[PDB]
């Protein structure tokens, strides 16, 4: 029950953080490219 729950919570949390970092880097690139 809860052991698996805590594992899944940590797995998706780690994924989200990775995706948020990648998205912030893409945001930064898109905003820079705006001025080209």
């Amino acid at each position: 029950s809860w052991e698996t729950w805590e594992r899944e919570i940590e797995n998706y949390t780690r994924q989200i953080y990775r995706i948020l970092e990648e998205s912030q880097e893409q945001q930064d690139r898109n905003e820079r490219d705006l001025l080209e």
Partner: protein, 35 residues
């Protein structure tokens, strides 16, 4: 392309957040049932 690639990033974030949200719902129903 940079905008579309960013949309792909945000969509995947929202999808992963939805999985997390369904895990929190499962957790609350488990505790509701106990109480």
């Amino acid at each position: 392309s940079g905008i579309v690639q960013q949309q792909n990033n945000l969509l995947r974030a929202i999808e992963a957040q939805q999985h997390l949200l369904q895990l929190t719902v499962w957790g609350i129903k488990q505790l509701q049932a106990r109480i």
